């Protein structure tokens, strides 16, 4: 049991080794409610967040917005619209490679 | 000016250093930098390791 446990974790970790590490995303995110028809059980579940990302050239910036689940973000500043990703305080996040099932 | 958890924020911090760990820049009394900055990057030892 212990060997299965350790080997699965080891293989899991190896598979993420070559994938992009998402450190450019630890920026403040300004989040508002989603402009759509949301059922009662989904109210407040999603947030529409914009942020300023780096790009291919380090002296250029881009405006990006995306939808996030509320569980992946945490408020900050003055408990208003300024939110950040949850992982930013604990550790950097790695994106899983899209080609790997 | 120290970096912080978020890339687009900075914090002002002060600390005490031993003189032997810093080197003046351009003979300017106000400006100093850490000794290792021109040479290899420094690494902090883990506080959990004796």
């Amino acid at each position, epitope marked *: 049991v212990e060997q299965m446990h350790e080997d699965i974790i080891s293989l899991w970790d190896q598979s993420l080794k070559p994938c992009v590490k998402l*450190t*450019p995303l630890c*920026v403040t995110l300004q989040c508002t409610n989603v402009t759509n028809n949301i059922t009662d059980d989904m109210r407040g579940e999603l947030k529409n967040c914009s942020f*300023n990302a*780096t790009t291919e050239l*380090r*002296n*250029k*910036r881009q405006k990006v917005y995306s939808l996030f689940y509320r569980l992946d973000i945490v408020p900050m500043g003055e408990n208003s619209t300024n939110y950040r990703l949850i992982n930013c305080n604990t550790s950097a996040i790695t994106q899983a490679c899209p080609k790997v099932s | 000016n120290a*970096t912080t958890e978020l*890339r*687009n924020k*900075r914090q002002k911090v002060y600390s005490l250093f031993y003189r032997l760990d810093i080197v003046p820049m351009g003979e300017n009394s106000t400006n100093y930098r850490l000794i290792n900055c021109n040479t290899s990057a420094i690494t902090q030892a883990c506080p959990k390791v004796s």
Partner: antibody
Amino acid sequence: EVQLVESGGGLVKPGGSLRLACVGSEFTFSEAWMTWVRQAPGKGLEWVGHMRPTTEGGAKDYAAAVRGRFTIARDDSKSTLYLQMNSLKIEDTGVYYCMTGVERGDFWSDDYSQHYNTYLIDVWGKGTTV
Amino acid sequence: EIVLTQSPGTLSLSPGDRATLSCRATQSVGGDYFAWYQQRPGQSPRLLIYGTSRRAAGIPDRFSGSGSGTDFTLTIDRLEPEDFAVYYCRQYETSFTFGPGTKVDI
């Protein structure tokens, strides 16, 4: 050279209509907050109305004096702001100015922190007289 | 529907003196929504100060100001001949209107 150029002003007898336009250049038009201000001879600066950046939703607002008579519109492919003034009155005579703001800045990121130092370029056109 | 007023009607100062220009609101305006412009007669107005205290790009350091709520001030450290213009205050939070303007004269 960031600039705005107004055109179309002239005097139309009361009850008629006139269309003004303003062409922006050297600025992403669609990202700009465009505002019409007018000044009749001997008068101060009167707000006419405005339209928020296209990219921020295109919301509009108007001075009470022109609500229901004036219409604000934009066509970003032409970098042009328009004002359609219907049911003109004598009190609508004056200089119509096209004014907006452009924030440009020098972005520079490292691998541990990023910064964006911005500067605001107040751009007004010369104004067109109605 | 907040209205701005200004004082004095005309400010009479010699060149080289210090201008003080007042603006008052009927209701509070957030600092990030208050601004001043300089209108040399015959010219389009030019933004001096925005966000209550922030200087516009291209504007000389002699221009400065401060304020909050319903009480704001624009000042000029030393008047130049070109500064004897009409200054207007403008709000842009809920109300996008201008005050009447103050002429600076000698």
